[PDB]
Enzyme design. Sequence first.
Site, PDB file in Angstrom:
ATOM      1  N   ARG A   1       0.798  -1.246   0.135  1.00 49.24           N
ATOM      2  CA  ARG A   1       0.105   0.141   0.018  1.00 49.24           C
ATOM      3  C   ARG A   1       0.922   1.313  -0.024  1.00 49.24           C
ATOM      4  NH1 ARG A   1      -3.411  -2.981  -1.355  1.00 49.24           N
ATOM      5  NH2 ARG A   1      -5.088  -3.789  -0.518  1.00 49.24           N
ATOM      6  N   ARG A   3      -6.859  26.759   0.422  1.00 47.07           N
ATOM      7  CA  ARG A   3      -6.172  25.518   0.465  1.00 47.07           C
ATOM      8  C   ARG A   3      -6.644  25.083  -0.824  1.00 47.07           C
ATOM      9  NH1 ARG A   3      -3.469  24.550   5.133  1.00 47.07           N
ATOM     10  NH2 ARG A   3      -4.898  24.860   6.977  1.00 47.07           N
ATOM     11  N   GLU A   8      -2.086  10.316   8.458  1.00 47.53           N
ATOM     12  CA  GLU A   8      -2.167  11.592   9.199  1.00 47.53           C
ATOM     13  C   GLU A   8      -3.191  11.074  10.293  1.00 47.53           C
ATOM     14  OE1 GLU A   8      -4.046  14.772   7.502  1.00 47.53           O
ATOM     15  OE2 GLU A   8      -2.843  16.288   8.871  1.00 47.53           O
ATOM     16  N   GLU A  65       5.733  33.828   5.092  1.00 52.19           N
ATOM     17  CA  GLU A  65       5.802  32.247   4.857  1.00 52.19           C
ATOM     18  C   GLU A  65       4.572  31.789   4.192  1.00 52.19           C
TER      19      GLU A  65
HETATM   20  N1  LIG Z   1      -2.864   2.886  -0.112  1.00 50.04           N
HETATM   21  C1  LIG Z   1      -3.191   2.211  -1.172  1.00 50.04           C
HETATM   22  N2  LIG Z   1      -2.160   2.027  -1.907  1.00 50.04           N
HETATM   23  C2  LIG Z   1      -2.676   0.988  -3.094  1.00 50.04           C
HETATM   24  N3  LIG Z   1      -3.745   0.442  -3.562  1.00 50.04           N
HETATM   25  C3  LIG Z   1      -4.788   0.650  -2.601  1.00 50.04           C
HETATM   26  C4  LIG Z   1      -4.655   1.559  -1.421  1.00 50.04           C
HETATM   27  N4  LIG Z   1      -5.840   1.794  -0.908  1.00 50.04           N
HETATM   28  C5  LIG Z   1      -6.590   1.168  -1.522  1.00 50.04           C
HETATM   29  N5  LIG Z   1      -6.072   0.492  -2.660  1.00 50.04           N
HETATM   30  C6  LIG Z   1      -6.647  -0.149  -3.447  1.00 50.04           C
HETATM   31  O1  LIG Z   1      -7.774  -0.018  -3.815  1.00 50.04           O
HETATM   32  C7  LIG Z   1      -8.870  -0.929  -3.256  1.00 50.04           C
HETATM   33  C8  LIG Z   1     -10.006  -0.436  -2.367  1.00 50.04           C
HETATM   34  O2  LIG Z   1     -10.861   0.546  -3.132  1.00 50.04           O
HETATM   35  P1  LIG Z   1     -12.012   0.936  -2.390  1.00 50.04           P
HETATM   36  O3  LIG Z   1     -13.013  -0.032  -1.696  1.00 50.04           O
HETATM   37  O4  LIG Z   1     -13.120   1.719  -3.598  1.00 50.04           O
HETATM   38  O5  LIG Z   1     -11.543   2.254  -1.599  1.00 50.04           O
HETATM   39  P2  LIG Z   1     -11.135   2.266   0.046  1.00 50.04           P
HETATM   40  O6  LIG Z   1     -12.320   1.595   1.006  1.00 50.04           O
HETATM   41  O7  LIG Z   1      -9.871   1.649   0.422  1.00 50.04           O
HETATM   42  O8  LIG Z   1     -11.142   4.056   0.249  1.00 50.04           O
HETATM   43  C9  LIG Z   1     -12.369   4.625   0.518  1.00 50.04           C
HETATM   44  C10 LIG Z   1     -12.226   5.514   1.629  1.00 50.04           C
HETATM   45  O9  LIG Z   1     -12.133   4.912   2.748  1.00 50.04           O
HETATM   46  C11 LIG Z   1     -10.787   4.826   3.449  1.00 50.04           C
HETATM   47  O10 LIG Z   1     -10.772   5.651   4.574  1.00 50.04           O
HETATM   48  C12 LIG Z   1      -9.989   5.500   2.341  1.00 50.04           C
HETATM   49  O11 LIG Z   1      -9.001   6.496   2.957  1.00 50.04           O
HETATM   50  C13 LIG Z   1     -10.746   6.254   1.465  1.00 50.04           C
HETATM   51  O12 LIG Z   1     -10.900   7.662   1.841  1.00 50.04           O
HETATM   52  C14 LIG Z   1      -8.022  -1.938  -2.554  1.00 50.04           C
HETATM   53  O13 LIG Z   1      -8.658  -3.126  -2.663  1.00 50.04           O
HETATM   54  C15 LIG Z   1      -6.929  -1.778  -3.255  1.00 50.04           C
HETATM   55  O14 LIG Z   1      -6.774  -2.556  -4.465  1.00 50.04           O
HETATM   56  N1  LIG Z   2       0.937  20.794   1.130  1.00 46.91           N
HETATM   57  C1  LIG Z   2       2.115  21.307   1.314  1.00 46.91           C
HETATM   58  N2  LIG Z   2       3.011  21.225   0.647  1.00 46.91           N
HETATM   59  C2  LIG Z   2       3.912  22.144   1.104  1.00 46.91           C
HETATM   60  N3  LIG Z   2       4.244  22.889   2.316  1.00 46.91           N
HETATM   61  C3  LIG Z   2       3.132  22.916   2.925  1.00 46.91           C
HETATM   62  C4  LIG Z   2       1.972  22.188   2.495  1.00 46.91           C
HETATM   63  N4  LIG Z   2       1.153  22.307   3.865  1.00 46.91           N
HETATM   64  C5  LIG Z   2       1.727  23.290   4.269  1.00 46.91           C
HETATM   65  N5  LIG Z   2       3.057  23.427   4.147  1.00 46.91           N
HETATM   66  C6  LIG Z   2       3.703  24.520   4.858  1.00 46.91           C
HETATM   67  O1  LIG Z   2       3.618  24.403   6.320  1.00 46.91           O
HETATM   68  C7  LIG Z   2       2.896  25.469   6.572  1.00 46.91           C
HETATM   69  C8  LIG Z   2       1.693  25.254   7.277  1.00 46.91           C
HETATM   70  O2  LIG Z   2       1.997  24.727   8.622  1.00 46.91           O
HETATM   71  P1  LIG Z   2       0.801  24.702   9.756  1.00 46.91           P
HETATM   72  O3  LIG Z   2      -0.029  25.840   9.862  1.00 46.91           O
HETATM   73  O4  LIG Z   2       1.704  23.716  10.784  1.00 46.91           O
HETATM   74  O5  LIG Z   2      -0.267  23.380   9.015  1.00 46.91           O
HETATM   75  P2  LIG Z   2      -1.623  23.347   8.197  1.00 46.91           P
HETATM   76  O6  LIG Z   2      -2.554  24.279   9.069  1.00 46.91           O
HETATM   77  O7  LIG Z   2      -1.170  23.786   6.572  1.00 46.91           O
HETATM   78  O8  LIG Z   2      -1.780  21.970   8.230  1.00 46.91           O
HETATM   79  C9  LIG Z   2      -2.684  21.638   9.513  1.00 46.91           C
HETATM   80  C10 LIG Z   2      -3.847  20.573   8.865  1.00 46.91           C
HETATM   81  O9  LIG Z   2      -4.763  21.481   8.624  1.00 46.91           O
HETATM   82  C11 LIG Z   2      -4.955  20.985   7.205  1.00 46.91           C
HETATM   83  O10 LIG Z   2      -6.096  20.932   6.875  1.00 46.91           O
HETATM   84  C12 LIG Z   2      -3.976  20.079   6.789  1.00 46.91           C
HETATM   85  O11 LIG Z   2      -4.258  19.000   5.894  1.00 46.91           O
HETATM   86  C13 LIG Z   2      -3.607  19.307   8.060  1.00 46.91           C
HETATM   87  O12 LIG Z   2      -4.403  18.455   8.276  1.00 46.91           O
HETATM   88  C14 LIG Z   2       2.737  26.382   5.342  1.00 46.91           C
HETATM   89  O13 LIG Z   2       2.894  27.928   5.770  1.00 46.91           O
HETATM   90  C15 LIG Z   2       3.591  25.948   4.344  1.00 46.91           C
HETATM   91  O14 LIG Z   2       4.537  26.656   4.510  1.00 46.91           O
HETATM   92 MG   LIG Z   3      -2.496  26.144   9.871  1.00 52.11          MG
END
Ligand SMILES: Nc1ncnc2c1ncn2[C@@H]1O[C@H](COP(=O)(O)OP(=O)(O)OC[C@H]2O[C@H](O)[C@H](O)[C@@H]2O)[C@@H](O)[C@H]1O
Ligand SMILES: Nc1ncnc2c1ncn2[C@@H]1O[C@H](COP(=O)(O)OP(=O)(O)OC[C@H]2O[C@H](O)[C@H](O)[C@@H]2O)[C@@H](O)[C@H]1O
Ligand SMILES: [Mg+2]
Lengths: 202, 205
Positions: free
Chosen positions: A46, A74, A134, A155
């Site tokens: 995976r 975002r 995460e 930043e």
């Molecule tokens: N990380 C992975 N890397 C490679 N193949 C993957 C991966 N994850 C799934 N597959 C392939 O994809 C198939 C599963 O596909 P479906 O059933 O439609 O998706 P779900 O239920 O996984 O993901 C649905 C959500 O729930 C979860 O929270 C996820 O984060 C999503 O957000 C597996 O059989 C693998 O062959």
């Molecule tokens: N995808 C990215 N790629 C590159 N640099 C990044 C990225 N994301 C952040 N930075 C750098 O890191 C700094 C932001 O860092 P902080 O405030 O601690 O993180 P957050 O609020 O973004 O993410 C926190 C959660 O909320 C969100 O939903 C996320 O998905 C996480 O789950 C930015 O200034 C960038 O310089």
């Molecule tokens: Mg933040």
Amino acid sequence: QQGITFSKNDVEIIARETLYRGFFSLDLYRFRHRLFNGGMSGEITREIFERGHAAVLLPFDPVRDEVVLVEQIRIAAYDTSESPWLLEMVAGMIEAGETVEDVARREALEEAGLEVGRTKPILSYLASPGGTSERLSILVGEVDASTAKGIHGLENEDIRVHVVSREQAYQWVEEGKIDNAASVIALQWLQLHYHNLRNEWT
Amino acid sequence: QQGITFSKNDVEIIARETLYRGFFSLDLYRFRHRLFNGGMSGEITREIFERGHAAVLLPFDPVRDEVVLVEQIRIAAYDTSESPWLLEMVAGMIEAGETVEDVARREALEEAGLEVGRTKPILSYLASPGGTSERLSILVGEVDASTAKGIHGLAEENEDIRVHVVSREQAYQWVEEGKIDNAASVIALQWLQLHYHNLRNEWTK
Ligand SMILES: Nc1ncnc2c1ncn2[C@@H]1O[C@H](COP(=O)(O)OP(=O)(O)OC[C@H]2O[C@H](O)[C@H](O)[C@@H]2O)[C@@H](O)[C@H]1O
Ligand SMILES: Nc1ncnc2c1ncn2[C@@H]1O[C@H](COP(=O)(O)OP(=O)(O)OC[C@H]2O[C@H](O)[C@H](O)[C@@H]2O)[C@@H](O)[C@H]1O
Ligand SMILES: [Mg+2]
Ligand SMILES: [Mg+2]
Ligand SMILES: [Mg+2]
Ligand SMILES: [Mg+2]
């Protein structure tokens, strides 16, 4: 024996490999695991998005029954959303030696100009555990929403503060105007617990 | 209140560059965007995990006040969780030309052996929009919990997925206790705790 799941003793992690290393990482996990019908799977792989873990703060003013939201872009929201600017909780990534509370309090000041009084843990959740490791840990923090205003962020961080009643913020969750997991989970929790939280903090 | 400030017209996506392409992909978005105090940013880059989008179904039996959960291994949970085997909602990835409901109903059958009656939207959320584009859209589906053929453990999909049937109150207690702690299930079960009274009345009239 309701809800008893299989355990870590039912899976064998064979190897973890890094496929990409930049700001974040993409790892490949290779493993075998027990099957519900008995016996073991073959080797499975995976891809895992590895970005560390985060702290989230729901800023709640119990006197005013208001929440403080932060607005920022975002870009990942672009393809599926009306606008990539989202209304969110204060949040930040956690580094070694830091606690959830350290990050929540620091980001409240940096992102919203907020001092925080008492805090309480809400919930800790996995964002999307089929593809990313995460975990985010949410606290509720006591704030004075009458102080909260303006533009903040470091930043390439440009953040606008919004203050709304709890009931309005929750309605925005129901309507889809707030639709990021951390804010949805935090505001649903607040809608289930605000009575006792306001009582506790007054 | 007023709401968000800016629209898609206020951002310029300059490029999306491949960082990794495998089963999923990682893109470098390069963009500039309008600032609250006026003008545009300089160029910003973000690494974004691209895995498509998903449909999620909360299977709720309103007659019995029960929920159907599915258990399967989610290896990414390993490093921070008690077990990588999680208690979850029925869920699947959405392919081109499929609706959320198409996928939710198909997965209910494939993952739990369940036919679904009425459905209602819960909400559609971005899993973690600072680093992934993934959106997941949740429906609640009316089910007869006794009819989850997946209860028997017999299908081949049941080597990988196991069905649990619990009371709503037990499922919600497991959210409060942290036993259920994946976003889709937390969101769906908190919603159910906020809406079950009216939903049971609607679906048992
Ligand atoms: N990380 C992975 N890397 C490679 N193949 C993957 C991966 N994850 C799934 N597959 C392939 O994809 C198939 C599963 O596909 P479906 O059933 O439609 O998706 P779900 O239920 O996984 O993901 C649905 C959500 O729930 C979860 O929270 C996820 O984060 C999503 O957000 C597996 O059989 C693998 O062959
Ligand atoms: N995808 C990215 N790629 C590159 N640099 C990044 C990225 N994301 C952040 N930075 C750098 O890191 C700094 C932001 O860092 P902080 O405030 O601690 O993180 P957050 O609020 O973004 O993410 C926190 C959660 O909320 C969100 O939903 C996320 O998905 C996480 O789950 C930015 O200034 C960038 O310089
Ligand atoms: Mg933040
Ligand atoms: Mg920050
Ligand atoms: Mg699935
Ligand atoms: Mg499936």
